[PDB]
């Protein structure tokens, strides 16, 4: 996962 | 003519540690580094304007607990022939997470990513990337740690390679490693 | 997707 | 030990 101000998405599948 | 940059972060002064240990702010002599590329988590300006005093570079990237939000959240600055990405870290989940590491690295195009948080250090290579964390400089505690060796991290930037200098605070006498990295 | 300054994400589903 | 721009120190990895 990535932490960002406009979401929080998968780097992959996981 | 070498380069070197003196990475470093987590200070976490003054809630979780009073002062950056004297003898780290011994080694770091005003002028005698170029450029200095911080993680973030000072958290307050007191330590921000002591960083200015040390060298006329100076990057701060945003923490979680940094109280001026003015600071960009990641930057990207090149260094002789480096190209050089910025984080504080906790965007990263899990933390310090390889895959998602690699990630910002790619996105930033960068040579070496920076990132710190997790108070433990790190420097090394991924698929022909290196990967620094300079640790907590001051020894500051993690949300699951209480003895956080502290650390700084000093870049030696000769031409294609990097030499990576690491000093820990194991007991009370400054200690260190080297790691050497070459642009591919 | 999504275009953030940290990458670009699927809106985690289609 | 080794030898860094900021002195000569030992070598943590002894």
Known sequence: YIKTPLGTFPNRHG | ?184
Chains 1, 3, 4 share one sequence.
Not at chain 2, 80 to 88: A, R, V
Not at chain 2, 102 to 116: E, H, K, P, T, Y
Request: proline share 4%.
């Open chain 2, 1 to 184: 003519d070498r380069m070197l940059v003196l990475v470093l972060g987590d200070l976490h002064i003054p809630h979780r540690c009073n002062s950056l240990p004297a003898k780290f702010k011994k080694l770091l002599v005003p002028g005698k580094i170029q450029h200095i590329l911080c993680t973030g988590n000072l958290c307050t300006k007191e330590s921000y304007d002591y960083l200015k005093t040390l060298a006329g570079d100076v990057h701060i990237v945003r923490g979680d607990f940094d109280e001026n939000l003015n600071y960009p959240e990641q930057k990207v600055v090149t260094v002789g022939q480096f190209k050089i990405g910025l984080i504080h870290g906790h965007q990263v989940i899990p933390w310090g997470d390889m895959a998602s590491l690699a990630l910002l690295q790619r996105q930033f195009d960068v040579d070496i990513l920076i990132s710190g948080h997790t108070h433990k250090f790190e420097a090394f290579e991924h698929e022909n990337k290196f990967y620094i964390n300079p640790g907590s400089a001051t020894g500051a505690y993690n949300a699951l740690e209480t003895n956080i060796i502290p650390s700084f991290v000093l870049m030696d930037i000769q031409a294609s390679t990097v030499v990576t200098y690491v000093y820990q605070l194991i007991g009370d006498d400054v200690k260190v490693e080297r790691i050497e990295y070459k642009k591919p």
